[PDB]
């Protein structure tokens, strides 16, 4: 997260770290045993690592859980980045509490202008590279789909938003991959692309959480 502040210990109890021996990706707790993340965060072997703050240092509160299986969308395109999302199920149930909770799925599609919330153990910098070790948050805005095609013309597809500022200084960044972007309490986007972080006319681009509903209750039924 880039231009952001220190979320606060256990302030956002859905985050999850995806760990692969040192963390990699967010994701997001919804419900005791599945993630939700971007499914350019696959990889073999994964630890999910929840109710974190420090990543570093082990304060009392985590859980550490290990993958029992990875659900890609079958439509992702790695290219394109069409369809970013993944689930991830959790070998046992996760223990509910207050410094670790799920969030909920949307039941319709955020309107433009409406302010979110994004997090993140990401790069901080815009340019260099700068790593924390507690948790990051930022407010920004979903931007009107025209300023988000003119941002990044032939490249949104329907399954995408664009959030941030277009004046730059203020985007999530390498390492936040796959985190949350909350609204109104639900979960409507996943931390996916962009033309670097932070950059004028650049802003984030995320997964549209809205239209996989189905597809996760679905798939969460069933599996
Ligand atoms: C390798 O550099 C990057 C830089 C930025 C991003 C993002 C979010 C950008 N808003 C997701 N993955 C990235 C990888
Ligand atoms: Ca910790």
């Not at 955020?110 to 910098?125: F, P, R, V």
Request: aromatic share 8%.
């Amino acid at each position: 997260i880039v231009g952001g502040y220190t979320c606060g210990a256990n302030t956002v109890p859905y985050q999850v770290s995806l760990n692969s021996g040192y963390h990699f990706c967010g994701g997001s707790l919804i419900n005791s045993q599945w993630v939700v993340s971007a499914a350019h965060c696959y990889k073999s072997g994964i630890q999910v690592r929840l109710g974190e703050d420090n990543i570093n240092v082990v304060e009392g509160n985590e859980q550490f859980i290990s993958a029992s299986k990875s659900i890609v969308h079958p439509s992702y395109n790695s290219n394109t980045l069409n369809n970013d999302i993944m689930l991830i199920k959790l070998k046992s149930a996760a223990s509910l509490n207050s410094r670790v909770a799920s969030i909920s799925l949307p039941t319709s599609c955020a309107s433009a202008g409406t302010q979110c919330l994004i997090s993140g153990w990401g790069n901080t910098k815009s340019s260099g590279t700068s790593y924390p070790d507690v948790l990051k948050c930022l407010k920004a805005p979903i931007l009107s789909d025209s300023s988000c095609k003119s941002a990044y013309p032939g490249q949104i597809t329907s399954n995408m938003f664009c959030a941030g500022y277009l004046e730059g200084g203020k985007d999530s960044c390498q390492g936040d991959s796959g985190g949350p972007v909350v609204c109104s309490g639900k979960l409507q986007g996943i931390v996916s692309w962009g033309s670097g972080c932070a950059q004028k006319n650049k802003p984030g681009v995320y997964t549209k959480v809205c239209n996989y509903v189905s597809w996760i209750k679905q798939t969460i039924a069933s599996n």
